[PDB]
Design a protein around this ligand. Structure first.
Ligand SMILES: N[C@@H](Cc1ccc(-c2ccccn2)nc1)C(=O)O
Length: 306
């Protein structure tokens, strides 16, 4: 059903009971925001895929091109940030998402909005605001006051958005917790898992250059996958298995030379995981299949961008 379709491949739903209450409503809205990113990667796509799930489930979708957040988070000047946000919109549209796109700065600098930001700054401890930014803040040896304005800026955004559901990666959870504690309307928070970087050494991120971009060329995708961390039998923190879990359609046919066991059809990610944990499926053949199927999945996106 819709709940299950929404829940599929999420890390958590802050409350399932509250989301069930939302799904009874006819008019319901879900939002996500992104600091504009020079490259749109599989992390982004995972969340937009989830936004599409909600859209299919009768939700109106709003995407915040979070230009002011990105400004607060040291991404550059607003005019430049906004150009990147416009590029990001194009990618999201190429992904098949029709939604309303709003630049946070269209409303986040209004006088009454600001006064509410100050109101929330009185209710939010520095310690809690800092903790909320631990996975989000730009690396800074000398953390700026802007870092603790960021979470109250976003919390007030959620308040102003009027959405019933907020979406983001697990790293967003502490900011979302603040929103649920501070605001008169508790937003349902759907968190998506954070993908491991291709080298398996941290989470996948724009600043770490450890991601596959939705517009990477086939040859780039093949090279990135060839080189990725993918230890035999190891599923945990294996970025290739995660791509297989989050992006691929099943039944999945894995091509292999007969000398390695010949073509392999797997009817679910859970079978794939079993075959991989049991070492019936070698990294090399997993990689080849994941690279080819991923290329196919991203191709219509790469094709539109042009
Ligand atoms: N914290 C997210 C960025 C992010 C996400 C959402 C919002 C927001 C929500 C409602 C209205 C306005 N803005 N602002 C910023 C990230 O790390 O990409």
């Amino acid at each position: 059903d819709e709940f299950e379709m929404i829940k599929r491949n999420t890390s958590e739903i802050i409350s399932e009971e509250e989301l069930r209450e939302v799904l009874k409503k006819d008019e319901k809205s879900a939002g996500i925001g992104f600091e504009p990113s020079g490259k749109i990667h599989l992390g982004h796509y995972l969340q937009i895929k989830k936004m599409i799930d909600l859209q299919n489930a009768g939700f109106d979708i709003i995407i915040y091109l979070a230009d002011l957040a990105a400004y607060l988070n040291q991404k550059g000047e607003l005019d430049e940030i906004r150009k990147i946000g416009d590029y990001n919109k194009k990618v999201f549209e190429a992904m098949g998402l029709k939604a309303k796109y709003v630049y946070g700065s269209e409303f986040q600098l209004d006088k009454d909005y600001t006064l509410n930001v100050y109101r929330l700054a009185l209710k939010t401890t520095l310690k809690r605001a800092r903790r909320s930014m631990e996975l989000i803040a730009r690396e800074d040896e000398n953390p700026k006051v802007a870092e603790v304005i960021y979470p109250i800026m976003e919390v007030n955004g959620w308040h102003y958005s009027g959405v019933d559901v907020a979406v983001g990666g697990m790293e967003q959870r502490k900011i979302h917790m603040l929103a649920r504690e501070l605001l008169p309307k508790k937003v349902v928070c759907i968190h998506n898992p954070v993908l491991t970087g291709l080298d398996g050494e941290g989470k996948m991120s724009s600043s770490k250059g450890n991601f596959i971009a939705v517009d990477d060329s086939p040859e780039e995708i093949r090279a990135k996958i060839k080189k990725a961390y993918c230890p035999a039998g190891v599923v945990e923190g294996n970025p290739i298995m995660e791509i297989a879990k989050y992006f691929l359609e099943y039944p999945l046919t894995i091509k292999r030379p007969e000398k390695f066991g010949g073509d392999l059809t797997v009817n679910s990610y859970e079978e794939l995981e079993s075959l991989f944990k049991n070492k019936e499926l070698h990294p090399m053949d997993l990689k080849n299949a994941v690279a080819e199927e991923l290329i196919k999945i991203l191709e219509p996106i790469r094709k539109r961008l042009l």
